[PDB]
Write a protein that binds this ligand. Structure first.
Ligand SMILES: [Cl-]
Ligand SMILES: [Cl-]
Ligand SMILES: [Cl-]
Ligand SMILES: [Cl-]
Ligand SMILES: [Cl-]
Ligand SMILES: [Cl-]
Ligand SMILES: [Cl-]
Ligand SMILES: [Cl-]
Ligand code: NA
Ligand code: NA
Ligand code: NA
Ligand SMILES: [Ru+3]
Ligand SMILES: [Ru+3]
Length: 129
């Protein structure tokens, strides 16, 4: 599913991501924009052989099981395919664990490079929330 901008903001808020660990909703929408262009089915292979899955491009090295990432963990206790669903619950619940791991949203390199320090509220501007 390809979410609209405000549609995704609303879904993220319903699932408790707004201000989670102090990160306002626009941070999460901005991250999803640059990770996946709001497409739940996005996948991308990393040089190390791991793969990133879903709207927030969550990586099989640590967070989900795909059966094809040697030596990896599955800290969210989910198949990576669950991160591709039109229902964002699994992605949100796993993102909550990731953002709590110590480095906040810097875990998403694209958030650090493209969202951090910017006017992230623009990503939710105009949305009925
Ligand atoms: Cl957009
Ligand atoms: Cl915001
Ligand atoms: Cl596993
Ligand atoms: Cl594996
Ligand atoms: Cl594990
Ligand atoms: Cl599994
Ligand atoms: Cl949803
Ligand atoms: Cl933080
Ligand atoms: Na939804
Ligand atoms: Na894994
Ligand atoms: Na749901
Ligand atoms: Ru930890
Ligand atoms: Ru860690």
């Amino acid at each position: 599913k390809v979410f609209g901008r405000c549609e995704l903001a609303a879904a993220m808020k319903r699932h408790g991501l707004d201000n989670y660990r102090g990160y306002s909703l626009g941070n999460w929408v901005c991250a999803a924009k640059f990770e996946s262009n709001f497409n739940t089915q996005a996948t991308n292979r990393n040089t190390d052989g791991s793969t990133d899955y879903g709207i927030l491009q969550i990586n099989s090295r640590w967070w989900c099981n795909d059966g094809r990432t040697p030596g990896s963990r599955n800290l969210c206790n989910i198949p990576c395919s669950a991160l591709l669903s039109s229902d964002i619950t699994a992605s949100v619940n796993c993102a909550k664990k990731i953002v709590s791991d110590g480095n906040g949203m810097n875990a998403w390199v694209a958030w650090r490079n493209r969202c951090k320090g910017t006017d992230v509220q623009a990503w939710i501007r105009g949305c009925r929330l």
